Design an enzyme around this catalytic site. Structure first.
Site, mmCIF file in Angstrom:
data_model
loop_
_atom_site.group_PDB
_atom_site.id
_atom_site.type_symbol
_atom_site.label_atom_id
_atom_site.label_comp_id
_atom_site.label_asym_id
_atom_site.label_seq_id
_atom_site.Cartn_x
_atom_site.Cartn_y
_atom_site.Cartn_z
ATOM 1 N N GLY A 189 0.810 -1.204 0.000
ATOM 2 C CA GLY A 189 0.000 0.000 0.000
ATOM 3 C C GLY A 189 0.840 1.248 0.000
ATOM 4 O O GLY A 189 0.623 2.117 -0.837
ATOM 5 N N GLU B 294 -8.898 20.545 -13.221
ATOM 6 C CA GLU B 294 -9.828 21.366 -12.440
ATOM 7 C C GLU B 294 -9.817 21.008 -10.958
ATOM 8 O O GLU B 294 -9.901 21.886 -10.076
ATOM 9 C CB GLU B 294 -11.238 21.190 -13.006
HETATM 10 N N1 GTP Z 1 -10.820 0.992 4.651
HETATM 11 C C1 GTP Z 1 -10.213 -0.173 4.507
HETATM 12 N N2 GTP Z 1 -9.003 -0.315 5.096
HETATM 13 C C2 GTP Z 1 -8.320 -1.453 5.003
HETATM 14 C C3 GTP Z 1 -8.852 -2.502 4.297
HETATM 15 N N3 GTP Z 1 -7.978 -3.513 4.376
HETATM 16 C C4 GTP Z 1 -6.905 -3.117 5.106
HETATM 17 N N4 GTP Z 1 -7.111 -1.836 5.514
HETATM 18 C C5 GTP Z 1 -6.201 -0.981 6.311
HETATM 19 O O1 GTP Z 1 -4.980 -0.671 5.639
HETATM 20 C C6 GTP Z 1 -3.904 -0.726 6.524
HETATM 21 C C7 GTP Z 1 -3.155 -1.990 6.116
HETATM 22 O O2 GTP Z 1 -2.956 -1.921 4.722
HETATM 23 P P1 GTP Z 1 -3.052 -3.211 3.777
HETATM 24 O O3 GTP Z 1 -3.727 -2.810 2.452
HETATM 25 O O4 GTP Z 1 -3.710 -4.298 4.536
HETATM 26 O O5 GTP Z 1 -1.537 -3.628 3.399
HETATM 27 P P2 GTP Z 1 -1.064 -4.012 1.890
HETATM 28 O O6 GTP Z 1 0.467 -4.317 1.855
HETATM 29 O O7 GTP Z 1 -1.525 -2.929 0.977
HETATM 30 O O8 GTP Z 1 -1.940 -5.331 1.578
HETATM 31 P P3 GTP Z 1 -1.252 -6.755 1.835
HETATM 32 O O9 GTP Z 1 -1.031 -7.297 0.424
HETATM 33 O O10 GTP Z 1 -2.138 -7.670 2.600
HETATM 34 O O11 GTP Z 1 0.083 -6.515 2.591
HETATM 35 C C8 GTP Z 1 -4.535 -0.799 7.904
HETATM 36 O O12 GTP Z 1 -4.804 0.529 8.311
HETATM 37 C C9 GTP Z 1 -5.841 -1.513 7.678
HETATM 38 O O13 GTP Z 1 -6.809 -1.056 8.572
HETATM 39 C C10 GTP Z 1 -10.089 -2.385 3.696
HETATM 40 O O14 GTP Z 1 -10.578 -3.335 3.096
HETATM 41 N N5 GTP Z 1 -10.775 -1.208 3.800
#
Ligand code: GTP
Ligand code: GTP
Ligand code: GDP
Ligand code: GDP
Ligand code: K2N
Ligand code: K2N
Ligand code: MG
Lengths: 123, 427, 429, 420, 428
Positions: free
Chosen positions: E136, E244
């Site tokens: 992420g 915009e």
């Molecule tokens: N709003 C929302 N937040 C999420 C969701 N899944 C994980 N999070 C949040 O995102 C953060 C963790 O990020 P992740 O997306 O799980 O990590 P990532 O590396 O992107 O995904 P992985 O491949 O599992 O490692 C934490 O704050 C979690 O609460 C979701 O489905 N919706």
């Protein structure tokens, strides 16, 4: 607060407009960083191939322990293979000449008993 | 494991005779044949003193040497006569002289080789010969002279195996010959370098035990042999009997001898007499211990007072409890605690075999390495130097083939042994 | 895995014969060798016996003596059926109560054969563990051959540990004066070739019987029954497979903290005579100088490793609280630097006694293997005699005779002096 | 994604045995065959702990190492016996010694390569091996010695993948061997540089949990294994079950370990032997219920994870989870922010309606290390029972070389009682 | 003209999956892609039947991307547009950027280039991604650097999921956000943060959900995003085009972060109450409760304001309603920019997910404000980061994968400086 709007567009499925309220009152991306990503790899391939040369260490020290034991064991066997049969062929020679010491004292109460009959058959 | 017996000299032989028939009784052997007795042990350890021949039969492992027929045909004509194998008799024909030299040098060496020839046989036949024993007089040639030669020639052949003798130290009183002191000192010497243990038996004792302790007026060479015959059975028993010792003869020696010279056990006995004197049952264990520890019951004439026991063995005879024996034994070690040596620790050990002798229900026999034996030695060396004084009888050894210096050369060797036993009132 | 017994010397052999007998009762083997349990072709008791042939159960033992006599009375009285005629070596002429004779003169000759007849028994074994050497301290072949054996076994057999059961010799039922020499001799050559060594003080055993068995003046076969029992409670661990003490290392890795210091002190629990005791009481006996196994006094020496070997009907639930008040009543007595011990070995197998023997069948028995520093009391009580004799060359000449060295004597006392020192050097900090 | 299991040593193995049949229960596997159960989940994450073979069949991804037959034929002869693949058994034959060196140096390296050989061919088969876990004693050679060797030899081959052990820290009371302090200190060292997390399990605890907390007089190695078996299912679940976590094992580690040494989770459990949520929670946060012999009061927690189990309202769960962090507020470090996270899966254990398990990285663990290093120097003192290793070919100073490693690990655990 | 969506990382992907779902409902496309100019802004009329999203989906495990090629919608994309990558990023940026990133980046970057190529005059990208958390933060950061190079003007809008203790699992969070947010901010154009805690909050208050799910939270973000992108999908005046978006909201290069506020979140089960008044919903936008990032803008100054209306509304109303947001509530304007309110009317009535949680509404509002109080959460993150790094806390895991002890220093540094610009816009 009761204002006047500036009409900013009308199309098919909408309409916009500003609504100004109380005038404002006047107050380089760089490509060359892909070599940055194989400096990241500069330091991983260093760390991992060192917890390899610190580990290809704890290894052939195991060579020692394992064998600098074995090697320190026959250190005893072939110390005391002669702490024996060299303490014990000092025995064989040690008595065997305490026997001779026994006997040559006999040929001497004996080669003495012989010559005093050559002294009887002469007296 | 197996022992042969050499028995040489009128005194040696007439002891040997009485010995044999007494032990031959214990085992039970017909004047010729084999076993006759309701006991069954006997035969375990008969192996040791009897080489057995064809038919039934049991024949002693015996050699009888003398330097004249006379006394050989006494045995063969007397008690257990034809028990010994006919050509185990080594005849003499010649003089004996009552002279050491004749027996050790001239007329002795004349025979000797024929003796060695029987002994070589018996012992070379004897499946694991452990050692020889010998009996003989010390004042008088055929025993003390030939024998001391025998033993010297016995070793050298058999270095190897342990040697052993009952020798009869001669007294000024109760003897035939003026010269014996001479004869004695000459063999004493010989012995002290060639034997491994030597039972000292004084005829001063033997005779004294009969008049002081028997009221026996005219003491023979008979009742007097009788004692030695008994005492010798005594000492032997536990190589020839139970299974409670086991008595290697060598073991037996190692544990008896501290210092390789001085193997001069003066011995002793429990009860006594033969003729019209008894025992009102009253041989008791206590009254049996403070009795084989009374001087006036010693087989040499010492007095195991002035002079201290090196080591002390005793063996006990009669189906009696040894729960008393050790307790009595201890008692005397405390009651006469003074006159043991400290420096060899547990230096008085005893064991018990439960099958009694001819007559007599209970009995103790004492072996005894007392330095008080110095008493005995100093007694002969005492009258000897009084004779070598202005050299008397010596001209019988002079011309025989002996030297002047030779008397002194072994007169000396004794004087040393004297002040070594004295040099063992130690620390 | 496997486990060979060597018994050298009259005393050794008779101790042997009187515990192979007791092993035999315990695992239910009728004299002829055949046992009617379903437990053999060729686990569990295979540690000591070997399923030789289709019927019999031969001990993995070799018996040596230098006379016949004693070895002889094995091939006589039933059990005659139990061994292989091979496993009993006799040797024609005696050692005569003298080490020199045993090691150098008479030993020389038979050692080669023995050493090899042993090698036969180690070969019918896949992963041999170690040896049990039973032998007499003082006395001839007992000290002198045993010494030579070990030197040699030490060479022919690598790791393969060696456990010795010494019979520390006692004036009252001995015959031999020369004793001390022989023990201080062997005990020197022997000790760097041994691993752990149970001493058994003849006097203390003689003692137990006079007190606890009501025997007037007890026999050898009296004493041997008793030692028989004790050994069988020590070896117990490796025979039935024990819930503790189950291999020769973690058996003794327990007892010996230091290379030299082998000598543990054993204590057998309920010796009581036929013609029962509480789990508590018997534990509170193990710490009673009377019931000891070597005549000494451990109330004043420090303990430095403690084992409790239980046999019979016992729940540990009991063992504990009983120990608890061995500490709050009696003399704790621990060294400066090792926990406060008590490896505790429970063996459910009820203790069997020799049938028309002296002792009775017990419900529970204890065994306590402690490595105290007071067992060097008997290291001096020996030393002293030796000292006071050699001081006069006493009996020496018999040794120098067979072929020995005036200084080999010096040099052996030297060792006890130094040992007597290490044992003293383990007190406090 | 997939995990193999190494289970070495009499203690290690008899734990591994109990573990496997309990987890094998949860999924439902016949002493041989396949699934038998009205549940359906199970099989999602069965992939992870079971490499499956032909027919129906499911066979654990297990390797059993010992340096003597004895205890191997205990498993094969006992409960879930012939469940493990016949030649995943690496035999010993030889001695073990209850001695570290033998297991790490001589008789150990003697085998080793045959172990690596099974592990290589299970893990090389394993489609995306995420890591290994290992079980074993720490006082006593075949487990603590070979295993510490194993893990050293396991890394290097697999740097890459995360390592993980339930190790049983031996106590002075309830033990066989005089020497164990030596064996422990030697592996503690080994561990502290080669594992990634290490569940500390004191037998001082395990035994204490039975006598102050259970009225069972004669505690076996049985009812006592029973705990570990349970606690071990506890910790694992959410790599092997729901889909509300998802628990990379690496993720799991990254978020549990602040500082690369010190991965020493003392664990804990909910109920005990053969439950409300409050009363459950103020029970996995009692010490009279910790798996290590500590008292998480002298020592604040670094990080703390708990998985709850039971079709129950976790609307109540963070309502009680918070509560501990406030009624016991000072005793979590502040300098890691949200350092007590928990999650909940609802498929209960063998029996039991509600349960929970607690992993805790407490510096109070320093108390257990100190305690062993305490009877250690007290022994290495006059160079004690040391001669059993002397002779095995180890070094005099190599002991002090690892006694120290531990006296820092003590005084860094000490050093993390810091400031905001 | 055209418009590509990139969703990296579990959170990203699911937010994505729950809003491509809601685009689908809104433009009436049956899952299979067939529906029986305008909205070509997002979908591409590929082949003769189907209506593929112009999206690319990247995650580093499969797992999540895997759910998509499973549940209907499995029909909606092209097997190509979903890139999975075997091993995880493990809750760590370093891993994402440098170690595991390296490998897949070259592929993703190119599979994007496929989608830009079937477009004549592409606009920009929408990057959906999780703030804290591994791929992420890390991949997104590496993507942007690179997208910044491969694509010139072509603007980039990010939707960040600012991370929240209650529904997270990861402690290491703060590090990862402060990390990315540094590398990322000079390569981004306007960036909507979405504070998980705030969305969790709405559902607990406004939806009566006890302890709400991810797919609870996602439906809600799904709604908000679809109200922000609304502009460019129906084409209704105001925010016609990505340029915009910034031109209205960001007065300063750095200051991207606008605060969103969604209007009538009300739960079916309440779906039949005489629904809300054009006035009332406007008067909600200015309610800390209904916010989108946990803060308080009553005390920070506004510096650009937009009101995005959707549904049945005549401007006649909007006005007088605004009039008394002034004369009642907190005005709150900066020293130097008019007094905002660009107002966007879109006649398309707002659709909600069918058996969802919320109800069909008649009018909804959206308020995109660029307040200086949204830097409250810039510090509420910062602080954790600070109080951890002060002890090197988890750092070694990063230095581990390959990073620099100082790259951490240097990223807090940036926030320190940002936190400053955001403070430096108050009064004079
Ligand atoms: N709003 C929302 N937040 C999420 C969701 N899944 C994980 N999070 C949040 O995102 C953060 C963790 O990020 P992740 O997306 O799980 O990590 P990532 O590396 O992107 O995904 P992985 O491949 O599992 O490692 C934490 O704050 C979690 O609460 C979701 O489905 N919706
Ligand atoms: N405990 C015990 N000790 C014995 C026994 N038999 C002899 N001894 C002791 O053994 C020690 C001497 O060793 P021995 O075996 O007798 O002599 P050896 O030379 O080894 O054997 P041999 O000389 O051939 O008979 C002495 O202390 C005796 O007390 C016995 O049956 N039990
Ligand atoms: N007790 C015992 N001693 C005897 C006997 N005969 C003689 N003696 C003593 O022993 C000494 C030597 O014995 P003798 O036979 O004359 O010596 P031979 O030349 O060997 O015959 C004599 O002087 C006596 O004192 C005997 O019958 N028995
Ligand atoms: N809980 C558990 N611990 C044990 C078990 N057996 C032994 N231990 C402990 O582990 C240590 C020794 O383990 P052990 O298996 O005997 O050593 P190894 O076989 O060489 O690994 C001792 O401190 C014991 O307390 C058991 O089966 N279960
Ligand atoms: C042929 C060899 O037999 C002899 O002529 N003489 C001989 C006889 C002995 C003796 C010994 N040393 N020599 N030792 C003894 C002993 C006494 C107690 C304990 C152990 C042994 C008992 C008297 N028997
Ligand atoms: C082999 C697999 O089992 C292990 O060896 N190690 C392991 C297992 C964990 C764990 C962790 N750190 N390590 N963390 C957990 C957690 C609990 C709540 C929230 C997030 C994680 C849950 C208990 N599972
Ligand atoms: Mg073990």
């Amino acid at each position: 607060a009761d204002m006047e709007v500036i009409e900013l567009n009308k199309c098919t499925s909408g309409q916009s407009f500003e609504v100004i309220l109380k005038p404002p009152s006047f107050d380089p991306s760089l490509e060359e960083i892909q070599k940055k990503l194989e400096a990241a790899e500069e330091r991983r391939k260093y760390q991992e191939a060192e917890l390899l040369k610190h580990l290809a260490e704890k290894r052939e020290h195991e060579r020692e322990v394992i064998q600098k034991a074995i090697e320190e064991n026959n250190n005893f066997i072939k110390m005391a293979k002669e702490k024996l049969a060299q303490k014990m062929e000092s025995n064989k020679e040690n008595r065997e000449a305490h026997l001779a010491a026994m006997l040559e004292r006999l040929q001497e109460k004996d080669k003495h008993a012989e010559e005093v009959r050559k002294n009887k058959e002469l007296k | 494991r197996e022992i042969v017996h050499i028995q040489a000299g009128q005194c040696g032989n007439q002891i040997g005779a009485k010995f044999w028939e007494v032990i031959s009784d214990e085992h039970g052997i017909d004047p010729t044949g084999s076993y006759h007795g309701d006991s069954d042990l006997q035969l375990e350890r008969i192996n040791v003193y009897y080489n057995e021949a064809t038919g039934n039969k049991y024949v002693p492992r015996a050699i009888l040497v003398d330097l004249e027929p006379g006394t050989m045909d006494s045995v063969r004509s007397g008690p257990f006569g034809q028990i010994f194998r006919p050509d185990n008799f080594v005849f003499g024909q010649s003089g004996a002289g009552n002279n050491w030299a004749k027996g050790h040098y001239t007329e002795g060496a004349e025979l000797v080789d024929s003796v060695l020839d029987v002994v070589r046989k018996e012992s070379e036949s004897c499946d694991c010969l452990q050692g020889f024993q010998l009996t003989h007089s010390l004042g008088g040639g055929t025993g003390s002279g030939m024998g001391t030669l025998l033993i010297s020639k016995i070793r050298e052949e058999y270095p190897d195996r342990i040697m052993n003798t009952f020798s009869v130290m001669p007294s000024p009183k109760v003897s035939d010959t003026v010269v014996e002191p001479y004869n004695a000192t000459l063999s004493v010497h010989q012995l002290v370098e060639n034997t491994d243990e030597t039972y000292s038996i004084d005829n001063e004792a033997l005779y004294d035990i009969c008049f002081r302790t028997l009221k026996l007026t005219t003491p023979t060479y008979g009742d007097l042999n009788h004692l030695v015959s008994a005492t010798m059975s005594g000492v032997t028993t536990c190589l020839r009997f139970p299974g409670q010792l086991n008595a290697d003869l060598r073991k037996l020696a190692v544990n008896m001898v501290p210092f390789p010279r001085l193997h001069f056990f003066m011995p002793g006995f429990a009860p006594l007499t033969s003729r019209g004197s008894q025992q009102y049952r009253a041989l008791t264990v206590p009254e049996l211990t403070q009795q084989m520890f009374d001087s006036k019951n010693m087989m040499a004439a010492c007095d195991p007072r002035h002079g201290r026991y090196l080591t002390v063995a005793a063996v006990f005879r009669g189906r009696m409890s040894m729960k008393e024996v050790d307790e009595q034994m201890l008692n005397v070690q405390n009651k006469n605690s003074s006159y043991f040596v400290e420096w060899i620790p547990n230096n008085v050990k005893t064991a018990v075999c439960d099958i009694p002798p001819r007559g007599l229900k209970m009995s103790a026999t004492f072996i005894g390495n007392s330095t008080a034996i110095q008493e005995l030695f100093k007694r002969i060396s005492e009258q000897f130097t009084a004779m070598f004084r202005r050299k008397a009888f010596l001209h019988w050894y002079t011309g025989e083939g002996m030297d002047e210096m030779e008397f002194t050369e072994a007169e000396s060797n004794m004087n040393d042994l004297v002040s070594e036993y004295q040099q063992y009132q130690d620390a | 895995r496997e486990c060979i017994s060597i018994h050298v010397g009259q005393a050794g052999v008779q101790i042997g014969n009187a515990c192979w007998e007791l092993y035999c009762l315990e695992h239910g083997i009728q004299p002829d060798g055949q046992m009617p349990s379903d437990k053999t072709i060729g686990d569990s008791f295979n540690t000591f016996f070997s399923e030789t042939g289709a019927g019999k159960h031969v001990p993995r033992a070799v018996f040596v003596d230098l006379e016949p006599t004693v070895i002889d009375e094995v091939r006589t009285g039933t059990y005659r059926q139990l061994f292989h005629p091979e496993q009993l070596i006799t040797g024609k002429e005696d050692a005569a109560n003298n080490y020199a004779r045993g090691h150098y003169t008479i030993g020389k000759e038979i050692i080669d054969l023995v050493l090899d007849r042993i090698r036969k028994l180690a070969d019918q074994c896949t992963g041999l563990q170690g040896f049990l050497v039973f032998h007499s301290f003082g006395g001839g072949t007992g000290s002198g051959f045993t010494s030579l054996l070990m030197e040699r076994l030490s060479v022919d057999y690598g790791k393969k540990s060696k456990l010795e059961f010494s019979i520390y010799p006692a004036p009252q039922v001995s015959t031999a004066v020369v004793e001390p020499y022989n023990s201080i001799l062997t005990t020197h050559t022997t000790l760097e070739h041994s691993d752990c060594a149970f001493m058994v003080d003849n006097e203390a055993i003689y003692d137990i019987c006079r007190r606890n068995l009501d025997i007037e003046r007890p026999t050898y076969t009296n004493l041997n029954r008793l030692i028989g029992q004790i050994v069988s409670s020590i070896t117990a661990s490796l025979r039935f497979d024990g819930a503790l003490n189950v291999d020769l290392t973690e058996f003794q890795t327990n007892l010996v903290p230091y290379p030299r210091i082998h000598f543990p002190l054993a204590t057998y629990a309920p010796v009581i005579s036929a013609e029962q005791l509480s789990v508590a009481e018997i534990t509170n006996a193990c710490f009673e100088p009377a019931n000891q196994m070597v005549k000494c006094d451990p109330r004043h020496g420090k303990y430095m490793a403690c084992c409790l070997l239980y046999r019979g009907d016992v729940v540990p639930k009991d063992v504990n609280a009983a120990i608890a008040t061995i500490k709050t009543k009696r003399t704790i007595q621990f060294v400066d630097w090792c926990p406060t011990g008590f490896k505790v070995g429970i063996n459910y197998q009820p203790p069997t006694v020799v049938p028309g023997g002296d002792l009775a069948k017990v419900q529970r028995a204890v065994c306590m293997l402690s490595n105290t520093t007071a067992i060097a009391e008997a290291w001096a009580r020996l030393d002293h005699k030796f000292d006071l004799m050699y001081a006069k060359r006493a009996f020496v000449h018999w040794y120098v005779g067979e072929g020995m060295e005036e200084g080999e004597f010096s040099e052996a006392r030297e060792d006890m002096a130094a040992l007597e020192k290490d044992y003293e050097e383990v007190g406090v900090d």
